[PDB]
Amino acid sequence: MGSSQPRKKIFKPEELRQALMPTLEALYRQDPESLPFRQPVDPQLLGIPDYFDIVKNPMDLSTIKRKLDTGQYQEPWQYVDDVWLMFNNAWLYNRKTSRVYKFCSKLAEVFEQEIDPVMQSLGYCCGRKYEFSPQTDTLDPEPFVDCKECGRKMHQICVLHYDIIWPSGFVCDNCLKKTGRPRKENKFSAKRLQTTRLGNHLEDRVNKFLRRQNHPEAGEVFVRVVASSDKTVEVKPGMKSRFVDSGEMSESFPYRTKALFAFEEIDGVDVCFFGMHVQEYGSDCPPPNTRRVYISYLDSIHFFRPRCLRTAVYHEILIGYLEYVKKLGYVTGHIWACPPSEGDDYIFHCHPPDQKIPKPKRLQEWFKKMLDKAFAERIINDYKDIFKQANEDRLTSAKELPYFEGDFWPNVLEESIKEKLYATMEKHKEVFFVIHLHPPIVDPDPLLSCDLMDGRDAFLTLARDKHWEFSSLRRSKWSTLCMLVELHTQGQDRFVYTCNECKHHVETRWHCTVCEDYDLCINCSHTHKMVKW
Ligand SMILES: CC(=O)SCCNC(=O)CCNC(=O)[C@H](O)C(C)(C)COP(=O)(O)OP(=O)(O)OC[C@H]1O[C@@H](n2cnc3c(N)ncnc32)[C@H](O)[C@@H]1OP(=O)(O)O
Ligand SMILES: [Zn+2]
Ligand SMILES: [Zn+2]
Ligand SMILES: [Zn+2]
Ligand SMILES: [Zn+2]
């Protein structure tokens, strides 16, 4: 059951006691906070028989000091794991509203700010014990990665190492200095994802907005449409009997669904902070969906830096989408303002616990605000709620309402099987918007095949199993890194190239470095720099 480590860094018991003792001394200094921790818990003194059956592996300050003094810690993580054990035992056993629970939380705060620089001085990422957020009484621990030259154990999420990107294995920054050469480039970046004219439009509008703000904390934003496919919304049986038998309305409605994401560079790395799924009903779509766009899903992670420009950037993305679909030929936008059902997430797997879920009222206000800005910029000609709109156009039948995939209305019309509807439209106050944007529509962007981003479910399921949470800036940095690999490899397979001015399938091609997509034949008729691929 062997293995070889050629230059394994190891610590002498004096190095470890010298570096780790100041952090233990800092815990002991907390008075009277450290007092119920300076010795083992005696359930005979406290009257708690329950204790040892709850706390399987007891731990206290005296035991850690004894272990340190006798040299029982061989590696620094051994020490930090025992300090975190003592904290977790106290948090597990005691009530959140108890003296010793609060004492524990204070000691943990001190340990966090003391052990981080200490572990960092020993060549480590940090000194935290990390466990992943609950699922479906046991938690999954965060992954580790040992260095190929050093042999030291570090948090994979801390170091942002992924074998797929760096297949030669993990080497810590300190060993890379000793080599002399830098860590190789992450070519699975958000910037390197397939560029689309729609994504380009939202990226340019959201980047020119940030240039006007002069914020130093703000980093370059990338908007990429990661999946684009052609689907149809089938008409549900009750409505089918009422309108498709007569021929008054279609059996299915053809739409193109698009999934786009927003990424911001934070601390030199990509961080995904926004995601949106839309449905687009074209020129050849029969009524009642002709020339309409519908935001099916919308989700965000609150790590956009700077925090103040967050909602303002979100509005620029939405307004940019309404602007791009207007110039293509779409005439009506539609928004269903419905905040997420309690725990459940729309697009991003694990939300930050400190990220607030807007109340339906607040969310209705949020969309109203962006639409006011869109109206002021002469992008949107008008916007009204679903009730007010049905009277202005004098709608008399159910076949007149736009019928979207996964929308509330197809289900409302359907549950009138047992059966009042016009009252239900008024019932849902400002939760249904109608946006007025004003020659067939011709989408210049090619269909991007990506099963992960074909439906909200595929990405949510994969991130749930792979633990790609979006609950902290460090975990979101990791999840973005892994998500980008999945998109890059599930999009690498789809690469059929044709000549832009001849249409024949070409293998060797000249690509323009200035254009978005410019691949011509072997012969060359152009201005900007072309490159042989
Ligand atoms: C079916 C559909 O398509 S519905 C689409 C809507 N999608 C969602 O609701 C998904 C989850 N929501 C989100 O990701 C975001 O809240 C967004 C993108 C909708 C809005 O982005 P933001 O403007 O950053 O969010 P929001 O308006 O909620 O937050 C603004 C402030 O209100 C606060 N706030 C939000 N919800 C609440 C609440 N329930 N109680 C009190 N305050 C709240 C936030 O803490 C924040 O405070 P701060 O900015 O001073 O720190
Ligand atoms: Zn770490
Ligand atoms: Zn190393
Ligand atoms: Zn060109
Ligand atoms: Zn050609």
XYZ file of C-alpha atoms and ligand atoms in Angstrom:
588
model
C 0.000 0.000 0.000
C 3.046 2.272 -0.676
C 3.873 5.742 -2.185
C 6.866 8.147 -2.625
C 7.247 11.832 -1.665
C 10.677 13.118 -2.825
C 11.003 16.553 -1.082
C 8.381 16.244 1.722
C 8.470 19.312 3.935
C 8.209 18.272 7.568
C 8.199 20.292 10.808
C 10.399 19.720 13.862
C 8.364 19.666 17.131
C 10.051 22.938 18.191
C 9.093 24.727 14.876
C 5.457 23.705 15.425
C 5.377 24.591 19.134
C 7.143 27.945 18.347
C 4.644 28.886 15.626
C 1.414 27.349 17.058
C 1.783 28.133 20.760
C 1.104 31.924 20.369
C -2.304 31.021 18.870
C -3.157 28.716 21.818
C -1.961 31.397 24.281
C -4.369 33.874 22.570
C -7.294 31.532 23.322
C -6.226 31.135 26.979
C -6.014 34.961 27.344
C -9.786 35.274 26.788
C -11.175 35.611 30.304
C -13.661 34.398 31.360
C -14.341 32.929 27.826
C -11.592 30.286 27.905
C -12.353 29.193 31.518
C -14.992 26.449 30.719
C -12.454 25.206 28.070
C -9.060 25.180 29.944
C -9.797 21.609 31.155
C -11.902 18.548 30.112
C -15.705 18.670 30.512
C -16.775 16.816 33.657
C -20.425 15.732 33.329
C -20.355 14.786 37.049
C -19.726 18.412 38.050
C -22.137 19.893 35.467
C -24.932 17.314 35.874
C -24.942 16.381 32.165
C -24.993 12.538 31.647
C -26.099 13.292 28.080
C -22.643 14.851 27.306
C -20.420 11.870 26.253
C -23.189 10.293 24.113
C -23.514 13.619 22.153
C -19.787 14.540 22.167
C -17.987 11.448 20.999
C -14.457 12.888 20.837
C -14.012 15.396 23.672
C -11.368 18.135 23.410
C -10.176 21.064 25.546
C -7.364 23.656 25.814
C -5.328 21.554 28.328
C -5.327 18.504 26.039
C -4.200 20.584 23.047
C -1.458 22.236 25.142
C -0.372 18.763 26.434
C -0.297 17.449 22.842
C 1.703 20.477 21.679
C 4.163 20.240 24.616
C 4.827 16.531 24.114
C 5.167 16.855 20.291
C 2.106 14.757 19.318
C 1.295 17.090 16.400
C 3.455 16.160 13.408
C 1.816 18.582 10.891
C 0.064 21.945 11.727
C -3.373 20.728 10.550
C -3.350 18.147 13.360
C -3.309 21.004 15.895
C -5.881 23.165 14.070
C -8.222 20.144 13.777
C -8.200 19.620 17.558
C -8.894 23.343 18.217
C -11.848 23.191 15.825
C -13.017 19.887 17.430
C -13.190 21.620 20.856
C -15.229 24.456 19.268
C -17.587 22.209 17.330
C -18.172 19.980 20.415
C -19.277 23.110 22.378
C -21.458 24.373 19.525
C -23.007 20.896 19.100
C -23.686 20.263 22.790
C -24.812 23.684 23.950
C -27.822 25.770 22.952
C -27.178 28.852 20.748
C -28.648 30.957 23.596
C -26.210 29.581 26.241
C -23.253 31.299 27.974
C -20.625 28.721 26.927
C -21.955 28.682 23.301
C -21.306 32.441 23.022
C -17.917 31.934 24.819
C -17.069 29.319 22.167
C -18.075 31.641 19.306
C -15.849 34.420 20.688
C -12.840 32.022 21.105
C -13.442 30.851 17.526
C -13.295 34.431 16.237
C -9.944 34.938 17.967
C -8.676 31.613 16.590
C -9.724 32.541 13.053
C -7.772 35.824 12.998
C -4.751 34.244 14.781
C -4.347 30.918 12.979
C -4.737 32.273 9.438
C -1.455 34.311 9.346
C 0.298 31.542 11.304
C -0.647 28.800 8.840
C 0.213 31.212 5.973
C 3.697 31.752 7.459
C 4.124 27.907 7.485
C 3.306 27.741 3.719
C -0.427 27.001 4.116
C -3.605 28.549 2.645
C -5.318 29.109 6.023
C -6.256 27.326 9.277
C -9.981 26.732 8.856
C -12.057 23.590 9.269
C -14.530 23.743 6.420
C -17.638 21.591 5.851
C -20.190 21.821 3.027
C -23.764 23.116 3.613
C -26.480 20.528 4.481
C -28.339 18.408 1.905
C -31.758 16.618 1.312
C -26.973 14.765 10.898
C -23.650 14.493 8.973
C -21.699 16.988 6.846
C -19.342 16.487 3.945
C -15.861 17.954 4.506
C -14.187 20.342 2.049
C -11.651 18.732 -0.356
C -7.908 18.747 0.132
C -4.938 18.676 -2.237
C -1.316 17.930 -1.315
C 1.541 19.721 -3.124
C 3.715 17.594 -5.509
C 7.033 19.127 -4.290
C 6.078 20.228 -0.722
C 3.747 17.420 0.299
C 1.620 19.919 2.284
C -2.170 19.489 2.601
C -4.162 22.535 1.475
C -7.871 23.320 0.849
C -8.606 22.748 -2.892
C -11.121 25.607 -2.838
C -8.471 27.872 -1.153
C -5.803 27.195 -3.758
C -8.305 26.942 -6.687
C -6.533 23.920 -8.130
C -8.326 21.582 -10.536
C -6.612 18.614 -12.233
C -8.609 19.215 -15.480
C -7.005 22.675 -15.854
C -3.557 21.750 -14.499
C -3.206 18.025 -15.285
C 0.452 17.879 -14.200
C -0.841 18.103 -10.572
C -0.822 20.732 -7.792
C 2.288 22.746 -6.855
C 1.983 25.467 -4.142
C 2.962 29.089 -4.889
C 6.091 28.784 -2.721
C 7.399 25.754 -4.660
C 6.588 27.614 -7.920
C 8.874 30.473 -6.736
C 11.660 27.878 -6.134
C 11.095 26.535 -9.696
C 11.324 30.081 -11.092
C 8.503 29.616 -13.640
C 4.906 30.839 -13.021
C 1.703 28.724 -12.716
C 0.327 28.087 -16.229
C -2.709 30.067 -17.560
C -6.281 28.941 -16.827
C -7.533 28.552 -20.424
C -11.036 27.549 -19.199
C -11.855 31.175 -18.447
C -15.196 33.009 -18.796
C -13.510 35.376 -21.296
C -12.491 32.362 -23.450
C -16.104 31.017 -23.585
C -17.842 31.285 -27.001
C -18.660 34.905 -27.812
C -22.213 35.733 -29.054
C -23.575 39.096 -30.398
C -26.277 38.960 -27.636
C -23.669 38.370 -24.907
C -21.445 41.034 -26.517
C -24.329 43.518 -26.434
C -25.002 42.923 -22.679
C -21.261 42.849 -21.861
C -20.561 46.121 -23.697
C -23.548 47.899 -22.073
C -22.575 46.647 -18.602
C -18.815 47.492 -19.114
C -19.299 50.983 -20.595
C -21.624 51.666 -17.575
C -18.852 50.665 -15.156
C -16.274 52.889 -16.951
C -18.549 55.905 -16.258
C -18.609 54.987 -12.503
C -14.765 55.075 -11.988
C -15.001 52.456 -9.187
C -11.572 50.989 -8.312
C -13.026 47.854 -6.670
C -14.947 47.039 -9.919
C -13.491 44.399 -12.250
C -14.169 43.500 -15.919
C -17.542 41.839 -16.516
C -18.159 39.040 -19.098
C -21.612 38.144 -20.342
C -21.741 34.838 -22.184
C -24.695 33.018 -23.721
C -23.697 29.445 -22.762
C -26.610 27.502 -24.347
C -29.118 28.267 -27.111
C -31.602 25.638 -28.448
C -34.940 25.326 -30.325
C -37.860 23.907 -28.383
C -41.710 23.957 -28.460
C -44.291 24.516 -25.714
C -47.049 21.896 -26.090
C -50.664 22.956 -25.443
C -52.038 21.181 -22.320
C -54.967 18.724 -22.847
C -57.794 20.921 -21.490
C -56.809 23.906 -23.634
C -56.092 21.515 -26.600
C -59.712 20.266 -26.481
C -60.998 23.865 -26.262
C -58.857 25.469 -29.031
C -56.671 23.088 -31.180
C -59.616 20.854 -32.257
C -61.415 23.989 -33.552
C -58.165 25.295 -35.130
C -58.380 28.617 -33.234
C -54.867 28.197 -31.750
C -51.762 26.029 -32.441
C -50.904 22.603 -30.918
C -47.359 23.769 -30.013
C -45.561 27.130 -29.963
C -41.967 27.251 -31.291
C -39.426 29.187 -29.237
C -35.669 29.462 -28.926
C -34.439 29.205 -25.325
C -31.189 30.906 -24.284
C -29.155 30.589 -21.072
C -26.741 33.462 -20.338
C -24.375 34.142 -17.422
C -22.522 37.148 -15.995
C -18.976 36.860 -14.632
C -16.878 39.434 -12.836
C -13.143 39.279 -12.231
C -12.697 39.339 -8.407
C -9.229 38.975 -6.869
C -7.876 38.076 -10.326
C -10.318 35.150 -10.859
C -13.718 34.645 -12.577
C -16.753 34.784 -10.276
C -20.217 34.038 -11.656
C -22.761 36.392 -10.058
C -25.828 36.325 -12.363
C -27.678 33.830 -14.577
C -30.749 34.139 -16.778
C -32.950 31.796 -18.847
C -35.172 33.332 -21.553
C -37.701 32.034 -24.122
C -37.941 33.778 -27.538
C -41.070 33.413 -29.707
C -40.252 34.506 -33.258
C -41.902 35.943 -36.378
C -43.114 32.562 -37.634
C -44.720 31.786 -34.255
C -48.507 31.693 -34.460
C -50.561 33.896 -32.098
C -50.756 34.491 -29.210
C -46.944 34.326 -28.843
C -45.738 36.065 -32.035
C -42.640 38.310 -31.545
C -42.449 37.879 -27.760
C -39.666 37.293 -25.224
C -40.215 35.862 -21.747
C -37.764 35.797 -18.776
C -38.327 32.300 -17.412
C -35.572 32.292 -14.815
C -33.280 34.840 -13.226
C -30.800 34.229 -10.372
C -27.850 35.935 -8.685
C -25.046 35.536 -6.137
C -24.309 38.756 -4.115
C -20.512 38.900 -4.562
C -20.378 41.537 -7.304
C -17.634 43.986 -6.309
C -18.438 46.836 -5.600
C -21.639 45.861 -3.654
C -23.322 49.256 -4.488
C -23.067 48.765 -8.277
C -24.634 45.213 -7.916
C -28.388 45.852 -8.574
C -27.350 48.647 -11.035
C -25.331 46.115 -13.067
C -28.284 43.630 -12.949
C -30.570 46.334 -14.393
C -28.045 47.088 -17.171
C -28.074 43.400 -18.160
C -31.884 43.156 -18.209
C -32.244 46.524 -20.059
C -29.565 45.406 -22.553
C -31.545 42.227 -23.269
C -34.764 44.224 -23.869
C -32.766 46.590 -26.143
C -31.169 43.740 -28.181
C -34.480 41.859 -28.698
C -36.176 45.163 -29.702
C -33.624 45.813 -32.460
C -33.975 42.182 -33.676
C -37.755 42.634 -34.123
C -39.364 41.375 -30.894
C -42.338 43.474 -29.921
C -43.408 42.256 -26.409
C -41.367 41.380 -23.303
C -42.981 39.540 -20.350
C -41.789 39.134 -16.756
C -43.222 36.863 -13.986
C -41.985 38.387 -10.730
C -42.108 35.365 -8.417
C -39.441 35.137 -5.644
C -37.977 31.671 -4.903
C -40.033 29.202 -2.867
C -38.326 29.420 0.572
C -35.095 27.262 0.498
C -35.062 26.145 -3.195
C -32.683 27.989 -5.629
C -33.548 29.031 -9.221
C -30.185 28.754 -11.058
C -27.229 28.913 -8.583
C -26.861 25.822 -6.327
C -26.111 27.094 -2.796
C -26.953 30.698 -1.991
C -25.031 32.725 0.661
C -26.932 32.381 3.984
C -26.616 36.187 4.348
C -28.112 36.715 0.802
C -31.712 37.847 1.376
C -34.696 36.519 -0.587
C -36.775 39.531 -1.676
C -40.437 39.555 -0.662
C -42.869 39.366 -3.690
C -43.661 43.113 -3.153
C -39.906 44.123 -3.195
C -39.287 41.991 -6.277
C -42.217 43.642 -8.093
C -40.592 47.039 -7.223
C -37.177 45.924 -8.427
C -38.498 45.070 -11.935
C -40.522 48.316 -11.974
C -37.322 50.284 -11.297
C -35.364 48.781 -14.201
C -38.352 49.317 -16.516
C -38.521 52.989 -15.472
C -34.823 53.339 -16.494
C -35.557 51.484 -19.771
C -38.495 53.857 -20.396
C -36.374 56.976 -19.669
C -33.666 55.771 -22.097
C -36.336 55.495 -24.890
C -35.541 51.734 -25.138
C -38.992 50.696 -23.793
C -42.012 52.523 -25.232
C -44.367 51.367 -22.420
C -44.973 48.771 -19.687
C -48.121 47.702 -17.831
C -49.383 44.761 -15.722
C -51.231 41.750 -17.293
C -54.736 42.895 -16.098
C -54.483 46.502 -17.385
C -53.089 45.212 -20.692
C -55.965 42.741 -21.372
C -58.517 45.556 -21.162
C -56.526 47.933 -23.406
C -56.451 45.302 -26.162
C -60.072 44.113 -25.257
C -59.216 40.448 -24.715
C -62.270 38.193 -24.482
C -60.869 34.631 -24.702
C -58.174 32.478 -23.112
C -56.584 31.821 -26.539
C -55.439 35.466 -26.542
C -53.013 35.249 -23.610
C -49.396 34.413 -24.378
C -48.754 30.700 -23.602
C -45.178 30.123 -22.289
C -43.193 27.084 -21.111
C -43.374 26.630 -17.344
C -45.468 29.789 -16.929
C -48.294 30.189 -14.407
C -50.942 31.012 -17.022
C -50.904 27.663 -18.988
C -51.598 25.989 -15.582
C -54.296 28.490 -14.564
C -56.155 27.942 -17.873
C -55.680 24.187 -17.367
C -57.074 23.970 -13.798
C -60.308 25.483 -15.179
C -61.084 21.836 -16.277
C -63.219 21.250 -13.126
C -64.729 24.761 -13.717
C -63.531 33.467 -12.871
C -60.318 33.675 -14.996
C -60.495 37.413 -15.686
C -60.693 37.850 -11.835
C -57.545 35.693 -11.457
C -55.662 38.106 -13.782
C -56.420 41.009 -11.409
C -55.615 38.733 -8.370
C -51.958 38.668 -9.401
C -51.074 42.307 -8.916
C -47.776 43.354 -10.529
C -46.550 39.712 -10.575
C -47.092 39.654 -14.431
C -45.567 42.374 -16.623
C -46.084 43.264 -20.329
C -43.230 45.289 -21.831
C -43.705 47.194 -25.072
C -40.692 47.335 -27.333
C -42.332 49.413 -30.137
C -39.598 42.057 -41.678
C -38.833 38.618 -40.133
C -36.676 38.298 -37.016
C -33.285 36.779 -37.900
C -31.048 35.823 -34.937
C -27.429 36.188 -36.038
C -26.176 33.970 -33.161
C -25.809 30.242 -33.834
C -27.467 27.634 -31.598
C -25.096 26.611 -28.794
C -25.619 23.029 -27.701
C -24.996 22.494 -23.981
C -27.077 19.982 -22.012
C -25.982 21.488 -18.650
C -27.549 24.838 -19.549
C -30.623 23.391 -21.359
C -32.994 23.827 -18.455
C -32.260 25.160 -14.964
C -32.267 21.590 -13.473
C -29.096 20.151 -15.070
C -26.716 22.740 -13.609
C -28.452 22.665 -10.187
C -28.267 18.876 -10.006
C -24.547 18.662 -11.027
C -23.444 21.435 -8.651
C -25.430 19.709 -5.837
C -23.423 16.495 -6.257
C -20.060 18.163 -6.962
C -20.584 20.597 -4.023
C -20.218 23.708 -6.238
C -21.916 25.999 -3.761
C -22.271 29.704 -4.305
C -22.518 30.416 -0.513
C -19.202 32.297 -0.016
C -16.840 34.351 -2.269
C -14.260 31.529 -1.901
C -16.761 28.739 -2.697
C -18.304 30.781 -5.596
C -14.725 31.320 -6.981
C -14.315 27.503 -6.917
C -17.760 26.688 -8.321
C -17.204 29.193 -11.152
C -13.821 27.606 -11.939
C -15.451 24.087 -12.156
C -18.583 25.282 -13.930
C -16.364 26.962 -16.576
C -14.525 23.673 -17.161
C -17.868 21.807 -17.581
C -19.038 24.474 -20.074
C -15.684 24.475 -21.872
C -15.521 20.681 -22.280
C -19.301 20.192 -22.974
C -18.941 22.954 -25.671
C -15.524 21.829 -27.097
C -17.225 18.905 -28.929
C -19.518 21.335 -30.876
C -17.155 23.067 -33.375
C -18.253 22.775 -37.074
C -16.538 25.515 -39.115
C -17.766 26.927 -42.481
C -16.390 29.765 -44.663
C -18.110 33.127 -43.945
C -18.107 34.215 -47.614
C -18.422 30.842 -49.454
C -20.449 28.661 -46.953
C -18.345 25.499 -47.654
C -17.145 23.480 -44.651
C -13.509 24.486 -43.927
C -10.988 22.761 -41.609
C -7.891 25.022 -41.840
C -9.115 28.624 -41.510
C -8.137 32.295 -41.066
C -9.807 33.848 -37.979
C -10.121 37.637 -37.482
C -8.784 38.842 -34.099
C -11.019 41.995 -34.270
C -14.385 40.421 -35.303
C -16.700 38.237 -33.145
C -16.884 35.367 -35.715
C -14.948 35.654 -38.980
C -13.719 32.405 -40.605
C -12.911 32.658 -44.360
C -11.536 30.215 -47.026
C -7.717 29.577 -47.546
C -7.691 32.390 -50.212
C -7.545 36.093 -49.072
C -10.489 40.631 -49.054
C -10.220 41.805 -45.407
C -9.064 44.662 -43.140
C -8.263 43.229 -39.629
C -5.573 40.641 -38.597
C -6.423 37.035 -39.628
C -4.794 33.923 -38.011
C -4.275 30.363 -39.400
C -6.099 27.622 -37.399
C -39.910 33.364 -12.111
C -38.873 34.441 -12.248
O -38.275 34.671 -13.261
S -38.631 35.364 -10.748
C -37.012 36.153 -10.967
C -36.526 36.674 -9.629
N -35.421 35.885 -9.114
C -35.159 35.775 -7.813
O -35.864 36.288 -6.949
C -33.925 34.980 -7.461
C -33.311 35.411 -6.141
N -33.074 36.848 -6.075
C -31.926 37.424 -6.458
O -30.993 36.791 -6.938
C -31.806 38.934 -6.266
O -32.488 39.321 -5.080
C -32.228 39.780 -7.499
C -31.280 39.509 -8.674
C -33.652 39.402 -7.921
C -32.200 41.265 -7.185
O -30.849 41.723 -7.000
P -30.587 42.802 -5.852
O -31.092 44.127 -6.270
O -29.179 42.691 -5.419
O -31.522 42.191 -4.702
P -32.624 42.696 -3.653
O -33.484 43.727 -4.286
O -33.287 41.522 -3.039
O -31.654 43.301 -2.540
C -31.536 44.714 -2.275
C -31.502 44.948 -0.783
O -32.747 44.511 -0.197
C -32.480 43.626 0.871
N -33.555 42.643 0.944
C -33.841 41.655 0.037
N -34.776 40.826 0.426
C -35.136 41.308 1.679
C -36.066 40.853 2.638
N -36.781 39.734 2.505
N -36.174 41.560 3.782
C -35.393 42.632 3.959
N -34.478 43.147 3.131
C -34.393 42.433 2.003
C -31.107 43.016 0.592
O -30.493 42.595 1.807
C -30.394 44.223 -0.011
O -29.854 45.052 1.040
P -28.446 45.833 0.820
O -28.372 46.022 -0.682
O -28.594 47.132 1.581
O -27.342 44.946 1.361
Zn -7.551 26.789 3.536
Zn 4.725 22.823 -1.896
Zn -12.850 41.053 -39.696
Zn -14.263 30.793 -48.968
